[PDB]
Amino acid sequence: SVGDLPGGLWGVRPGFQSPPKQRYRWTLKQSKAEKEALLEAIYRQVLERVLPEG
Amino acid sequence: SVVTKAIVSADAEARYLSPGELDRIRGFVSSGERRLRVAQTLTESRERIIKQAGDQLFQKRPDLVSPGGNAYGAERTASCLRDLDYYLRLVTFGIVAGDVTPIEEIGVIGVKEMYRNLEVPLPGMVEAVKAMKSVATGLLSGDDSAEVGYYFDYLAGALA
Amino acid sequence: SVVTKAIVSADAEARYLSPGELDRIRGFVSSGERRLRVAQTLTESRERIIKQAGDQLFQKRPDLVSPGGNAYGAERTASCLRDLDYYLRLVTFGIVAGDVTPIEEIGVIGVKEMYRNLEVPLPGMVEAVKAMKSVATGLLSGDDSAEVGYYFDYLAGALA
Amino acid sequence: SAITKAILNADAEARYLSPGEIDVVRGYLASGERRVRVARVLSDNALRIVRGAGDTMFQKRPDLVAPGGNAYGEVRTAKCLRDLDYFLRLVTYGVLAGDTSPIDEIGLIGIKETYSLLEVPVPGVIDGIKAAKQQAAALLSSEDAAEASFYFDYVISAMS
Amino acid sequence: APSNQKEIIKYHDLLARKGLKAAVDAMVTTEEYTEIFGDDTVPFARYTTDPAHGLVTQAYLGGVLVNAKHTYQNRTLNFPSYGPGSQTGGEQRSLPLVPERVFSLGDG
Amino acid sequence: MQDAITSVINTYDVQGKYFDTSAFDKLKAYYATGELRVRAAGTISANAATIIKEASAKLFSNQPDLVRPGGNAYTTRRYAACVRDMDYFLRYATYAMLAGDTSILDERVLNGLKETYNSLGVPISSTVQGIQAMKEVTGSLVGSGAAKEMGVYFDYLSSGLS
Amino acid sequence: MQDAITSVINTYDVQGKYFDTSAFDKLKAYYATGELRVRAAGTISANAATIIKEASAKLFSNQPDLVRPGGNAYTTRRYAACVRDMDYFLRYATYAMLAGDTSILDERVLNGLKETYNSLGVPISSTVQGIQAMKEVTGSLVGSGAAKEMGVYFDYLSSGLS
Amino acid sequence: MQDAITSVINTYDVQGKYFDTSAFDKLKAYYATGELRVRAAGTISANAATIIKEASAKLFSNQPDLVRPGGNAYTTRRYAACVRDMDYFLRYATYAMLAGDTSILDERVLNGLKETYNSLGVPISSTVQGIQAMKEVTGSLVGSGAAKEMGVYFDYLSSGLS
Amino acid sequence: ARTISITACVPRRTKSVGASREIQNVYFTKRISFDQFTPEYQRIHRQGGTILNVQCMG
Amino acid sequence: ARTISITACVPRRTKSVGASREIQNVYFTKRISFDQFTPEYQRIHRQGGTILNVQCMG
Amino acid sequence: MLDAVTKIINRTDAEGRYFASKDFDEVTRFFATGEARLRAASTISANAASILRESAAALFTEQPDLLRPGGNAYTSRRYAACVRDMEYFLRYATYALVAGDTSVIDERVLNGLKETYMSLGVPIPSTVAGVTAMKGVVASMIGSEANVYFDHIAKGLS
Amino acid sequence: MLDAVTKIINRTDAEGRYFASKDFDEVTRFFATGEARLRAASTISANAASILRESAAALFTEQPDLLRPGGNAYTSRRYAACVRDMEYFLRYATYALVAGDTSVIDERVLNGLKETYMSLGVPIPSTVAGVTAMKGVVASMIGSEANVYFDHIAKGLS
Ligand SMILES: CCC1=C(C)/C(=C/C2=NC(=C\c3[nH]c(/C=C4\NC(=O)[C@H](C)[C@H]4CC)c(C)c3CCC(=O)O)/C(CCC(=O)O)=C2C)NC1=O
Ligand SMILES: CCC1=C(C)/C(=C/C2=NC(=C\c3[nH]c(/C=C4\NC(=O)[C@H](C)[C@H]4CC)c(C)c3CCC(=O)O)/C(CCC(=O)O)=C2C)NC1=O
Ligand SMILES: CCC1=C(C)/C(=C/C2=NC(=C\c3[nH]c(/C=C4\NC(=O)[C@H](C)[C@H]4CC)c(C)c3CCC(=O)O)/C(CCC(=O)O)=C2C)NC1=O
Ligand SMILES: CCC1=C(C)/C(=C/C2=NC(=C\c3[nH]c(/C=C4\NC(=O)[C@H](C)[C@H]4CC)c(C)c3CCC(=O)O)/C(CCC(=O)O)=C2C)NC1=O
Ligand SMILES: CCC1=C(C)/C(=C/C2=NC(=C\c3[nH]c(/C=C4\NC(=O)[C@H](C)[C@H]4CC)c(C)c3CCC(=O)O)/C(CCC(=O)O)=C2C)NC1=O
Ligand SMILES: CCC1=C(C)/C(=C/C2=NC(=C\c3[nH]c(/C=C4\NC(=O)[C@H](C)[C@H]4CC)c(C)c3CCC(=O)O)/C(CCC(=O)O)=C2C)NC1=O
Numbered sequence A: 001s002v003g004d005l006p007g008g009l010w011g012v013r014p015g016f017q018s019p020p021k022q023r024y025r026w027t028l029k030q031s032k033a034e035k036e037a038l039l040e041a042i043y044r045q046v047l048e049r050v051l052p053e054g
Numbered sequence B, C: 001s002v003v004t005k006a007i008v009s010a011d012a013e014a015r016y017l018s019p020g021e022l023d024r025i026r027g028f029v030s031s032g033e034r035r036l037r038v039a040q041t042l043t044e045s046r047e048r049i050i051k052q053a054g055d056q057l058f059q060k061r062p063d064l065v066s067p068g069g070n071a072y073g074a075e076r077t078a079s080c081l082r083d084l085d086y087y088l089r090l091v092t093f094g095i096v097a098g099d100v101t102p103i104e105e106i107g108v109i110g111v112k113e114m115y116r117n118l119e120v121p122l123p124g125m126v127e128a129v130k131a132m133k134s135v136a137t138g139l140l141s142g143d144d145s146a147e148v149g150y151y152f153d154y155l156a157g158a159l160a
Numbered sequence D: 001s002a003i004t005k006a007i008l009n010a011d012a013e014a015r016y017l018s019p020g021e022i023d024v025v026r027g028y029l030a031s032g033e034r035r036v037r038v039a040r041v042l043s044d045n046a047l048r049i050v051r052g053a054g055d056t057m058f059q060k061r062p063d064l065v066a067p068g069g070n071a072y073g074e075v076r077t078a079k080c081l082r083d084l085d086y087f088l089r090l091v092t093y094g095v096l097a098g099d100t101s102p103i104d105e106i107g108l109i110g111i112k113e114t115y116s117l118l119e120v121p122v123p124g125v126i127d128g129i130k131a132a133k134q135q136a137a138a139l140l141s142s143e144d145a146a147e148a149s150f151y152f153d154y155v156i157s158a159m160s
Numbered sequence E: 001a002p003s004n005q006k007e008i009i010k011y012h013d014l015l016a017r018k019g020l021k022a023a024v025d026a027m028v029t030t031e032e033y034t035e036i037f038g039d040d041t042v043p044f045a046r047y048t049t050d051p052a053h054g055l056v057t058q059a060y061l062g063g064v065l066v067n068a069k070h071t072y073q074n075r076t077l078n079f080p081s082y083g084p085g086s087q088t089g090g091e092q093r094s095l096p097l098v099p100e101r102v103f104s105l106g107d108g
Numbered sequence F, G, H: 001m002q003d004a005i006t007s008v009i010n011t012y013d014v015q016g017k018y019f020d021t022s023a024f025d026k027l028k029a030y031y032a033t034g035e036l037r038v039r040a041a042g043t044i045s046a047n048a049a050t051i052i053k054e055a056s057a058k059l060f061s062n063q064p065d066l067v068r069p070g071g072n073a074y075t076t077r078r079y080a081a082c083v084r085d086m087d088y089f090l091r092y093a094t095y096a097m098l099a100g101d102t103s104i105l106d107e108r109v110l111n112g113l114k115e116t117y118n119s120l121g122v123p124i125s126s127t128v129q130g131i132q133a134m135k136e137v138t139g140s141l142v143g144s145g146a147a148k149e150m151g152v153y154f155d156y157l158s159s160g161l162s
Numbered sequence I, J: 001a002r003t004i005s006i007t008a009c010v011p012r013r014t015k016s017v018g019a020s021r022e023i024q025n026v027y028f029t030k031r032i033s034f035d036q037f038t039p040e041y042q043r044i045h046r047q048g049g050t051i052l053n054v055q056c057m058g
Numbered sequence K, L: 001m002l003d004a005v006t007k008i009i010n011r012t013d014a015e016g017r018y019f020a021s022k023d024f025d026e027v028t029r030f031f032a033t034g035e036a037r038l039r040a041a042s043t044i045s046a047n048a049a050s051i052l053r054e055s056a057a058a059l060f061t062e063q064p065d066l067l068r069p070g071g072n073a074y075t076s077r078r079y080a081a082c083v084r085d086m087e088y089f090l091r092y093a094t095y096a097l098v099a100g101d102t103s104v105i106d107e108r109v110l111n112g113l114k115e116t117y118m119s120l121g122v123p124i125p126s127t128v129a130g131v132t133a134m135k136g137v138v139a140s141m142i143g144s145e146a147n148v149y150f151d152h153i154a155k156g157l158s
């Protein structure tokens, strides 16, 4: 009833990617930590994981 | 729950919990006995809460239990009282959890569609939640009354 | 078809068909018998249509069947006549369907790549289609000739 | 044996021996001398193979000979070593025969029901057979060890 | 996930004829991307049925299957194509006229 | 998708033939029922919410454990998802009736639905019962002929799930 | 993910019951351990890089062929991938310890991980050895009671991978 | 992907050694054939459309049922897709010939192709016949040594499919 | 309950000769239930077979 | 190549209101590559939006 | 069913040609791998019970809901059928490994299996997860020699 | 097949729980109505020939066209098939009445019956008229205990 991922038997999401219900939205004015975090969200969802440094 | 919310916010950033979220969890776990006593108090007196709340709701909105109303008849009034009991149980769940996540995920998502399908008036739901809030906060001390009233306000806003 | 387009339109908006879409279907259904009569007139005269259309094509475009032409020789000319027969059958399909969707799904999507591979000149396809349009619309009545000329025009614009 | 298998296959469809059957028989006849060597080595060393296998088996799981165990007592332990000797003799029979039919007919068909009735733990018997396989392979050449190991593993798989 | 063969065909033709950049350009310029993600939301895995925007049941099943998968979990094509046949093509195999072997007391 | 007319067209296009007499018979048969289908679709559209309400009441009355704690329809989100599924089934069955062909049910409803319900723990037999309840209510609503027609696509959904 | 609180809520909600004395005992036990869990989480986050350094040093000391040519951790890219895997294991183990529940390990780490490691050629026994090294170092850092708590989730990961 | 040079590099990296005389012979052998490969690739690139026209014409002459109704190559869309796939095979064979290694054919072509074609109903024997037709047509353009080289990759594709 | 053992010789004249073993079909003794006695009796007579012996053990 | 700065106002008149912040995607100024310009021009037109300013940076 | 030699024979016969040099080379390559394939098949046969045990353990560790009440593996009979199916997969993959061809799997295993599972409600993605787990165990014992055959079964179910 | 008690057992087993008070009340209600249901079933069984006679007469008086040439009940064979189908309906209604559940009608009767009738050209509306006539004839004898099972057959057929 509480705290179940969508998908039933396949209600799983590899920890390399974002938690299945998280959203990330760009706002015009936001802190630089939020800008960083949204950048890792983009890399995390397009490339499926965090790139190595560089 | 508070713990799950902090862990999920930290997981959404792929980092360990910051000092602020750990402060949040310490505050949650230090208040555990108080909210456990409050939840036990609400559970012990569930019958009185449901009975007084039903009485107050049917006094303030008599068309629900008059002919043609959604809760008209003994069986439908029993169904009305039953899901007032549902929402009291969810309120105790949300109190022990420390947030409205159990309430939200068991009783709030798709609640307007469910009560649309069931022909249940939604302002009637809001008025029932307010009546329960008055009765349930009557049984508690002021500090406990305010915290429980917040959860009941979350229900009232969710239904409205 | 008309019904398929109306249903796709309603489904893309996740709703029941509006009165406009039902009017589209209703007007299509009322015209069904006339559409079948037109398509049957075209079908019974398929061989005469293809023969006369090929004649006008090869008179208007002798370079197609001249040496060095794409349709030079009996086999290549027969394949040209076969393609004209294909598109006539597709026109009858479109007429019974009330729209050019069968024509697009069988003979237009990827057509320019196919004739590029075959070195079939697309302008010559355009005058072949215009010839077959003249011949076919000659056989039909005045009201029907324009309606089928629309299908021939769509196909000619798709080849060009 | 290996010859009877080919003859049965030929007789099933009422024909003479096929070239493949002839080749199988020829290979068995060619391998006969190695088979006799392996069988003779296994036979002349039977007692110490059985002794070592029994000792290692009892060491692995002592509950077999513990009070309440199935091998508890002198007579039941003697029957245990008798079973190990039986299985080794059947292994030598299979080595000589070139197939598993002697092992099946004499000792494998019905052993499952027998041990289930007598409450013999199949895993313990499998452990004893593995120990016998190790003791036999210890005193054989690599090719001979593999040749015996096929039949030991066949017996083990028949247990399970 | 792609839900049908037409969805596969569009982007496969874009990859076959014009390359990766053209296919990405086409896919982020679709009206579904604009409606669901818009201009400033990072795309996210979608789990609620929404047929008007492409989450039909097959899209949902394929999406929950692929989103359950680690990166480089395998090399199999989870949607090789939708079509009449099966991936192994066993429907096209020849069946034996008789079973390989028949059981008779007379046969031994 | 594929309606009845495009189904006839496809059958004749794979065989590479112009329309025969039997093809024109099938096309006339479809056109003969067009007005009936349109009337039925308009009626079902007018009363879609009522149909869903009555059929969901019937389903849950016959199987009360679905909505009590521990049932697959026990939570507001799960009740809403169930009635939403019933709404989908009715809308797509109306589409299929209008098209005169079950192709749309295959491509957009039935393909992957059984494995989806299996993976989510949705009781398939109960879903079939809900579709049957919708069939009865819808048929009583739209009358004898439109019921005889809507029942085909309801039974198609039922067989696909079963 | 579920924590201890939500685990109790899930059982009582599927049973449709109010909390009884047993539920209150369980929730009370979680609140009692909460301070210890928070302190262990803070200690692990403060020392996460040191834990990964010491544990990977131990793992590549016991299995030095992993970092030599032909090992699965020989290249800068694959070495970085390995230490990154260890970092994720440590962070999710800390999450699960905070929640007092292994659900997050099932939902975010373990499912399909073994098949991925098999498909990539990652030696799964060596990964389990690296997790055991992280357990030993972490338990040295966080103290005996927190060591018992945290080792449960470390062992849950090790068993999921074995 | 992997070319011949990076293939030598990968072997020697995995075994952790500098290049020796044998590696240098393999690299000299690749460099010596380089001009022939570049010439063949330029010739095929200049003639690719002609090669595809000739090969598709020979294939559809040998199997006329493909492009007549009821055939897998019967529609403008399916004919276009057929010759598109032939463009794939020619282009990827040219890549593998220029690289001197078949790894790109494994990664970019053959993986999952049988499953795609068996799911679609695309006849694989006719696809192999078309690949053979392209092999002869390409050999007709590039000359003895280049033909022998390109035939290796055409045969690799044929074996991977058939 | 009662059963019958019937011994019959069924020649194979109507059929062609076959390399397959057929002696088991030609001469047999089989155990049948009483309800099956008439059908197999008539079946043996249909095939040209001769009823050699009939026994009822009790 | 070249980048074009488009300042556009794209209302939401075709759909219902929502509580989420929406202002940034309604009125915006972005510059896009020349090859993306026609699709964005037409997309703004299709959603009922208005093109307020077009500039060529350079 | 077919093996590698019979597959090559049918290929040469479809062309009505004799064996060319490349065909002989392919048959020689098949003969050369025979000893390794036989030792791998014997290794699988010797450890079949353990392979099945660890494969089932891995499957139900990944998806414990299958064993819980209401799961498709919940009953003695249904769990029995699940482990029996995995045992069939193991034995027939060993057969295909010996023959060198996947035709035995098509003839004896995928002959209505997907239809049977869709009809009975057997969760196919979970079955594929189990097949892949068994592939991992077999690869841990004998190496990659059998992977393709296991993949075949998975592709037959998807 | 399923009766009411097996239905309750299956429900609780799928939830993986023991019987509770509500399930015991339900099964006690079943045991309470069982004796009346056996009386109805035995009365139907004893009078089955009379029931078929009356119901066939009622059907063919309502619809005389069926018996005339060209009708679907016009022959000795088609009439025998018709009365046989009514016999089936009554027998399986008695089974369902004893079981207290209609799943036996869904499995043994209704599944495939619509396709059988469409294939043969049996007029389904007239068959439903026959089922209704049987329902009236049976209700005139035992009361209203079997009404729901005939209504189930009628809804399934229509
Ligand atoms: C149902 C949709 C469909 C179409 C239309 C179609 C056309 C088509 N036309 C072909 C050949 C041809 N088609 C033409 C037709 C051209 N001759 C003149 O130039 C004219 C401008 C023009 C016709 C009016 C010719 C000349 C050939 C022979 C070309 C060659 O072999 O070099 C071929 C190659 C195989 C064959 O000859 O059967 C196809 C596939 N295929 C399809 O699946
Ligand atoms: C050559 C063919 C052949 C075989 C294979 C064979 C096995 C066999 N062993 C038996 C008894 C036994 N067998 C065993 C040995 C077993 N129990 C121990 O725990 C061990 C785990 C295990 C052996 C490794 C024992 C202890 C008994 C005596 C049990 C009893 O008295 O009930 C019996 C029952 C009759 C008897 O007492 O002799 C049979 C038939 N007999 C045969 O004629
Ligand atoms: C347009 C065609 C279409 C259909 C039909 C469809 C069905 C469908 N229903 C779903 C969930 C669901 N479906 C149901 C319905 C069940 N509840 C009771 O058991 C009943 C027996 C039964 C309905 C009568 C429920 C309760 C859920 C929620 C399951 C969960 O989240 O745990 C889901 C998973 C995704 C989501 O929740 O949005 C799908 C895909 N999706 C589609 O795109
Ligand atoms: C735990 C989360 C949850 C909730 C809350 C819930 C509500 C709920 N209330 C229902 C019936 C009902 N609910 C009510 C209540 C209304 N009557 C008056 O209008 C009042 C304004 C109002 C109550 C204060 C009534 C009268 C019925 C019976 C009406 C009917 O039969 O449709 C039903 C139909 C199923 C049944 O009768 O058991 C549901 C699912 N379901 C859930 O899974
Ligand atoms: C082929 C790509 C590759 C590289 C380059 C690589 C480097 C590498 N160097 C290591 C150790 C080391 N590397 C160094 C080198 C540093 N010491 C000084 O500060 C210098 C600035 C600098 C070298 C010029 C040292 C001192 C160690 C020992 C660290 C220790 O004992 O813990 C290790 C740990 C395993 C081992 O010692 O065998 C790796 C993996 N690994 C790779 O797979
Ligand atoms: C949070 C849940 C989660 C995990 C754990 C996870 C693991 C993971 N590890 C991967 C690669 C890898 N993982 C390792 C680590 C191993 N090799 C060493 O020998 C060690 C024994 C061992 C680590 C202790 C290596 C070396 C690779 C690269 C393999 C390759 O590219 O060939 C990959 C493939 C994609 C990539 O390169 O980033 C994944 C998905 N993904 C997840 O979403």
Ligand SMILES: CCC1=C(C)/C(=C/C2=NC(=C\c3[nH]c(/C=C4\NC(=O)[C@H](C)[C@H]4CC)c(C)c3CCC(=O)O)/C(CCC(=O)O)=C2C)NC1=O
Residues within 6 Å of the ligand: I011, I012, I013, I016, I017, I018, I020, I021, I022, I023, I024, I026
């Ligand atoms: C595999 C073991 C086997 C044996 C041995 C065997 C013998 C055998 N011989 C038979 C008939 C016969 N056998 C013979 C042959 C004999 N009469 C001639 O005079 C010869 C001297 C002599 C043979 C050398 C003849 C003539 C008949 C036909 C007699 C009849 O049925 O009227 C029949 C009756 C079935 C039939 O007519 O085909 C059997 C069963 N059947 C078996 O399955």
Ligand SMILES: CCC1=C(C)/C(=C/C2=NC(=C\c3[nH]c(/C=C4\NC(=O)[C@H](C)[C@H]4CC)c(C)c3CCC(=O)O)/C(CCC(=O)O)=C2C)NC1=O
Residues within 6 Å of the ligand: J011, J012, J013, J017, J018, J020, J021, J022, J023, J024, J026
């Ligand atoms: C949280 C920050 C935020 C703000 C402030 C905001 C304002 C805002 N209001 C809008 C529409 C609107 N806003 C109004 C406001 C009313 N007009 C008059 O009648 C009243 C005097 C007045 C309110 C008291 C109206 C009428 C529209 C619709 C205009 C139209 O679509 O033609 C729009 C266009 C997009 C849409 O229709 O939703 C924005 C961006 N949006 C934001 O994201």
Ligand SMILES: CCC1=C(C)/C(=C/C2=NC(=C\c3[nH]c(/C=C4\NC(=O)[C@H](C)[C@H]4CC)c(C)c3CCC(=O)O)/C(CCC(=O)O)=C2C)NC1=O
Residues within 6 Å of the ligand: K066, K072, K073, K078, K079, K081, K082, K083, K085, K086, K088, K108, K109, K113, K116, K120, K122, K123, K126, K127, K130, K131
């Ligand atoms: C030798 C060739 C052969 C194959 C391949 C075969 C598979 C097979 N499995 C079946 C049922 C089954 N198969 C499974 C297995 C599933 N359970 C799930 O939890 C798992 C994910 C998954 C296994 C990994 C189950 C549980 C059943 C019983 C389903 C039921 O009866 O409801 C059935 C239906 C008949 C029966 O129950 O025996 C077949 C035919 N049988 C054969 O004779």
Ligand SMILES: CCC1=C(C)/C(=C/C2=NC(=C\c3[nH]c(/C=C4\NC(=O)[C@H](C)[C@H]4CC)c(C)c3CCC(=O)O)/C(CCC(=O)O)=C2C)NC1=O
Residues within 6 Å of the ligand: L060, L067, L073, L074, L075, L076, L079
């Ligand atoms: C074309 C082939 C065909 C045949 C053969 C046939 C016979 C037939 N006779 C019937 C009734 C009947 N049959 C009879 C005849 C009997 N009355 C006296 O006893 C006489 C001894 C005897 C006639 C010589 C009577 C009186 C009825 C109606 C009364 C009843 O229901 O038994 C019925 C039942 C349906 C009905 O009421 O009409 C059939 C099917 N029907 C056919 O479609």
Ligand SMILES: CCC1=C(C)/C(=C/C2=NC(=C\c3[nH]c(/C=C4\NC(=O)[C@H](C)[C@H]4CC)c(C)c3CCC(=O)O)/C(CCC(=O)O)=C2C)NC1=O
Residues within 6 Å of the ligand: L066, L071, L072, L073, L077, L078, L079, L081, L082, L083, L085, L086, L088, L089, L108, L109, L113, L116, L120, L122, L123, L126, L127, L128, L130
């Ligand atoms: C136990 C469940 C069961 C049912 C229900 C069942 C029905 C059934 N009815 C059949 C034929 C038939 N059924 C009928 C009955 C119709 N005639 C009309 O006038 C009447 C309105 C109506 C009956 C009330 C007729 C006439 C046939 C013969 C059809 C033909 O051969 O043309 C047949 C085909 C076999 C045959 O020729 O006898 C079946 C299987 N079978 C079953 O195993």
